[PDB]
Amino acid sequence: MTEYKLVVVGAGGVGKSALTIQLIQNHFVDEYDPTIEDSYRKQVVIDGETCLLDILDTAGQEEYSAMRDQYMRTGEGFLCVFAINNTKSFEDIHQYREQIKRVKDSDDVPMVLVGNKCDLAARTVESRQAQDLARSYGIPYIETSAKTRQGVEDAFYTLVREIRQH
Ligand SMILES: Nc1nc2c(ncn2[C@@H]2O[C@H](COP(=O)(O)OP(=O)(O)NP(=O)(O)O)[C@@H](O)[C@H]2O)c(=O)[nH]1
Ligand SMILES: [Mg+2]
């Protein structure tokens, strides 16, 4: 069956693992548990296609950068995650995107911009500005909460659908 290699990237603590675990295991992880690199494989039916989600969950820490180039090379699609209560993580997005283009030798890689932690009232990043950034890149913007599961499948499946269209 078709395997879709999805890579989850973004700054430390934005919820890359929480999103992935909510998708695979239907539980919200509220623990402190930094990632080095973890992979998940799940058989799913998306729009009637049977396929295998191979999800590469990456570290937000600069120390794991080289490890970064490796996985970025193999990915077909990228979830670029920031947290809506963390303006620095939103600024960092640009830098993850540019490294993705660099390692993929491509201006146009399947990608979704994900604003996570949308359950929180303490927003510092307006939806408007994330939407603008995503338009500027030519990719969808999806808001998610790993905590409430709002948007979680939407983010992953939308990325699959981007890959299908590339
Ligand atoms: N309220 C809320 N908290 C969240 C959400 N997603 C993650 N968190 C919380 O944020 C913290 C960090 O999440 P985690 O998934 O470990 O983040 P990460 O991006 O994978 N960290 P790293 O780069 O170290 O691996 C955890 O305490 C987690 O429960 C969310 O959608 N809403
Ligand atoms: Mg993690």
Side-chain angles (χ1 to χ4, degrees):
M1 54 179 68
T2 313
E3 183 159 335
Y4 291 104
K5 300 186 188 301
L6 316 174
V7 184
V8 187
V9 310
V14 299
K16 304 176 292 300
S17 299
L19 282 167
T20 301
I21 293 160
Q22 186 58 267
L23 186 79
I24 297 311
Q25 301 188 26
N26 320 284
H27 70 112
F28 174 63
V29 180
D30 64 3
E31 202 197 342
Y32 181 100
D33 186 22
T35 304
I36 291 165
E37 77 182 348
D38 282 330
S39 56
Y40 296 87
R41 287 166 61 77
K42 192 48 166 257
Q43 300 169 250
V44 295
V45 192
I46 303 180
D47 307 308
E49 183 181 36
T50 48
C51 53
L52 188 71
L53 292 196
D54 197 316
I55 302 154
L56 293 73
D57 179 31
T58 67
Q61 293 53 261
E62 81 294 7
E63 289 98 334
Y64 290 111
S65 182
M67 208 165 277
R68 193 140 64 247
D69 286 44
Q70 249 197 348
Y71 50 70
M72 285 187 162
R73 195 166 314 112
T74 62
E76 312 169 83
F78 298 79
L79 280 191
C80 287
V81 187
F82 71 94
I84 62 80
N85 71 333
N86 181 344
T87 291
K88 185 42 159 42
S89 77
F90 181 58
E91 298 174 2
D92 293 345
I93 278 303
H94 193 63
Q95 301 310 139
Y96 291 95
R97 177 168 187 268
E98 292 293 306
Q99 179 184 52
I100 290 160
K101 284 152 62 179
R102 219 159 276 143
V103 299
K104 303 299 286 174
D105 283 326
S106 321
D107 294 338
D108 185 34
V109 167
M111 196 185 295
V112 169
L113 185 63
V114 175
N116 186 51
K117 317 203 179 176
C118 76
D119 57 287
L120 295 173
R123 180 184 276 274
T124 60
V125 175
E126 282 302 324
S127 306
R128 205 57 98 187
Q129 76 187 103
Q131 185 61 65
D132 295 343
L133 183 55
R135 179 178 303 106
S136 102
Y137 297 157
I139 69 183
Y141 174 52
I142 305 211
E143 291 205 345
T144 61
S145 175
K147 182 167 164 173
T148 72
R149 216 198 169 74
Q150 186 199 330
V152 171
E153 287 168 24
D154 220 331
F156 287 91
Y157 292 13
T158 290
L159 186 57
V160 169
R161 287 184 198 115
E162 290 297 300
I163 292 174
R164 287 180 178 158
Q165 291 171 247
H166 168 270

